[PDB]
Amino acid sequence: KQKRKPKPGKRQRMCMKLESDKTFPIMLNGQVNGYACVVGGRVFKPLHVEGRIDNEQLAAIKLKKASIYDLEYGDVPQCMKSDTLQYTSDKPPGFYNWHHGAVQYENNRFTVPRGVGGKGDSGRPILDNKGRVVAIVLGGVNEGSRTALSVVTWNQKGVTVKDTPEGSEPW
Amino acid sequence: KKRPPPPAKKQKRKPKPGKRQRMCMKLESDKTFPIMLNGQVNGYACVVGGRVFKPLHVEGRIDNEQLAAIKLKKASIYDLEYGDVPQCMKSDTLQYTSDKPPGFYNWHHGAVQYENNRFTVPRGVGGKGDSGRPILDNKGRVVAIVLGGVNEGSRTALSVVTWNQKGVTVKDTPEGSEPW
Amino acid sequence: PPPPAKKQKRKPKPGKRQRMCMKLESDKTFPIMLNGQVNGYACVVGGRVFKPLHVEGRIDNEQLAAIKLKKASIYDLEYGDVPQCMKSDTLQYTSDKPPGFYNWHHGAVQYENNRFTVPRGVGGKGDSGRPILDNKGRVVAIVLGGVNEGSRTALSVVTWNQKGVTVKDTPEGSEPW
Amino acid sequence: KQKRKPKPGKRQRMCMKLESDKTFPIMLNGQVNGYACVVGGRVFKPLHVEGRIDNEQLAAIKLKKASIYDLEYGDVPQCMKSDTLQYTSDKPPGFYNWHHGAVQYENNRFTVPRGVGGKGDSGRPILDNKGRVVAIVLGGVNEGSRTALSVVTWNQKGVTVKDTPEGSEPW
Amino acid sequence: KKRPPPPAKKQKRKPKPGKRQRMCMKLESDKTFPIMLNGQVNGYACVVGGRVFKPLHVEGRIDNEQLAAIKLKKASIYDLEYGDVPQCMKSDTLQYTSDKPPGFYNWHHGAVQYENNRFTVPRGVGGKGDSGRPILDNKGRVVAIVLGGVNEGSRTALSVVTWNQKGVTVKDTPEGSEPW
Amino acid sequence: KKRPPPPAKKQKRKPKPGKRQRMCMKLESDKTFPIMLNGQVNGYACVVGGRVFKPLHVEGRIDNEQLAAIKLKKASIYDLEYGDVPQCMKSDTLQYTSDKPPGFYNWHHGAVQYENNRFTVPRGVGGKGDSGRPILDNKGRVVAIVLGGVNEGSRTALSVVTWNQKGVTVKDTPEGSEPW
């Protein structure tokens, strides 16, 4: 409850920025297990968890099997489609947004510190500080000092392609 | 047994000649570790951006149970060893680039610069006991690892293992480099 | 409460007419959402509950979502009742219609031309099934639909006649809400 | 420091432990028909009461009809298991706790006054001044000025009952 | 390098909230010793009133040459090991009783109490890495040694190995206890 | 963490009874090293003027990788071992003479003098655990190394291994010397 007069800025540019974004978890236990986030025209529900979406018009969608991606893609109604997560395709090396931390981009691998994301949280999008998603996390993986996220991103030709560091965790 | 909050016994006096700790402060902060043959230091070993570059020429054990009890095969075409690095020394250790500009890179025993193609340090660097040193930026970014190279008049020219402009791992070596 | 949280309360206290939305505090209809989007509401009246046939979902109240209704085709609704907590139906009965202004959820309608009437586009898609309320809290008319009337906008309602017998009051070319 | 009390009687006035050890209601279409919780790591839900537990993790427990006990027993998971309270083998003759008032042990019978209880929430356990579960209450008839209830007292040996005095109606 | 007779760098300030060091001061003063598998602590081991209770489930070496180079057979019916304790860790180490009242016993990661039959600590105790902990009195007297036991809502219920009221070495164990 | 140039925590007070540190200051400054059998000190070992005199009676390892991993044969006619000393412990370690005058020589557990032929220290010296001690001058010059010898009333007479007046390595030994 400390109220001094420092520099604000959400520390660090995720605290409202992820929270305003429409990523909706519902577990069978009524909690998070893996995040369905609306991305452009489609929502990316995790394939390898069990649960639904915190929206009646999004959880009632039938979603197609992206075993290519370890997620599921499906329709997003227009009542969500404007306020979907606008994306970006590029990924320069830099600090990006994570609601538990931050990735620093390195060697096509997005790296939160150890124990920050990966397990029980993934599908949380990775946001630009300019405010764009690069990638959707699948789970894992502990890289010791840090933790590289197994992500699903666009490439240089803008192709939605799953990345998997070896031995990654299932969500 | 008293209670100050004391800063800095050694090297934070108010008179500073300079702040050229880029060859000392980052290099000790690197995850480099000696290959001590019966305690005798015959070359340092370090994890570089992924795989570890253990000196294949140098025998002895390393200050890491994740590295010393760890069998590595032979890059005898370069006199190197690879990794096989466990995850606990992954995600930030000795990032780099493949190229080098004609600029100031470093290690433990001083800094390196050369005009065209190669690497040279001033005379008195030592190639024995130390070699196996990554060649970091003022940013802290490797370009090579020391193979030695003889003292040459004013400056010790270096042999290294390094990378191509195409990123291909190569070795730069003058005639009659120094052992490790 | 450090910025205004209504505890500084207010200078203009009730020195004039009370409100027109105190009877919308008695709005015991429910936001019938077919997949998160309100198509209509479920109107209790006399305990006998209904909702328009144009509307699917249905109901955030688990009670009213558990009662199978009966289709009234030429009233464009499906009717049933509310079991075992029935005086939640504050939405009681009007039939008497003096040509005045009766409370509706986006402002009071105008009654004239045997018709309840809001201004231009005051309705919205979702305003089907809304009750139209007396200043006694009594509910006269249940919005099936409506149609724009240039300066104002009609309301196709389920209301009653002078005998109090139900009527699908419908303007020509009315559309759902 | 949050009490704000001028001079209260120093007694556990049926909310410090009793509302803290709240026994979860059994609602059926809004109308609460009983209470139900877990004591001793085994679920109790009254057999004379239909409806739904507050907890999803308890309402998903398939229960076994103890027909000579008017309870539908099963097993809690870990999720509450430590909070499933307490008992020591005694029935001291005197006033006990109650989620509306007080009940008196008298002649192997629980004497609560009239009006208090006997309504339609019939699963509250009588609690001790030690907070120990005394008796899950299932029925009871107004014995005029006072009221005896259908309870589980377990016994002097800790062995369960359906302790129903005569004429007692399941509330 | 000066000459005071100084007391207590760390924890003898004049403000004291309490004196509940019975779970910390005696327990470190106990002759308990970690089983560190390659340095990684996977369970402590301790001499209790005679024989040592080495975790049979846990591999690694112990901080005692009188205990680590010392072969112990299998109480796999309880997942324990016995002693075989040399005399240098005999005559006072971890006295005990067989029973337990419904009262406050302890270890490293907090205190334990339970109403009837068993042992429960609050949630967050850890069963991994620590288990092999003796359960001492405020007097300092064991009643059990931790087998684990899952977090259960508010409190972590425990599995232990313990003793009968007849003194018979038994195990108390909930369904699905935690490993070590 | 402060900055004095401080002298001498322990033993440089201004009151001095004497300066008889010739049995303690030189002897610790000697290159003597314990033979610790499982850590238990059963005799010191030292390089003397060349070859090392390892106690052949005493088992265990030595605080020197140049001495402990170093196989030495048996002078069982004297119960000694020889050297085989690497050059890093050569050129000044425990110079000596062969003779002894009836004078004050020393080690760790006190000083030695005897009238005619032999060596005796006062009672309470210990022969167990320590023996393998060189017998230095106030100059710092060996004449023998302790074999033990029993407490004899007032003074502990000693057995040693020593040298002849002709320099021949011999042993002086009373009847029933002490083990090591």
Residue numbers in the entry:
A (entry chain F), D (entry chain I): 91 to 261
B (entry chain C), E (entry chain C), F (entry chain C): 82 to 261
C (entry chain L): 85 to 261
Excerpt from the paper describing this PDB structure:
Here, we report a 4.4-Å cryoelectron microscopy (cryo-EM) structure of eastern equine encephalitis virus (EEEV), an alphavirus that causes fatal encephalitis in humans. The icosahedral shell of alphaviruses consists of an outer layer of trans-membrane envelope E1 and E2 proteins and an inner capsid layer separated by a host-derived membrane. Alphaviruses utilize the E2 protein for attachment to incompletely characterized receptors (Schwartz and Albert, 2010, Zhang et al., 2018). Endosome acidification triggers conformational changes in the E1 and E2 proteins that generate the fusogenic conformation of the E1 protein (Gibbons et al., 2004, Haag et al., 2002).
The EEEV capsid protein consists of two domains: NTD, residues 1–116, and CTD, residues 117–261. The capsid residues Lys81-Arg114 in SINV (corresponding to EEEV capsid Lys82-Lys112) have been implicated in interactions with the RNA genome. In the EEEV cryo-EM map, the main-chain coordinates of the genome binding capsid protein residues Lys82-Lys112 were observed to be adjacent to the capsid CTD. The residues Lys82-Gly99 form an extended network underneath the capsid CTD. These residues form an extended coil that contains a high concentration of basic residues and structure-disrupting Pro residues. The current map of EEEV confirms that the density into which Lys82-Gly99 has been traced is indeed a part of the capsid protein. In EEEV, the residues constituting the RBS (Lys97-Asp111) form a coil and a short helix. The RBS was located on the inside of the intact NC cores. This implies that exposure of the RBS requires at least a partial dissociation of the icosahedral capsid shell. However, the icosahedrally averaged EEEV cryo-EM map shows an ordered main-chain for the capsid genome binding residues Lys82-Lys112, implying the occurrence of repetitive RNA-capsid interactions across 60 icosahedral asymmetric units.
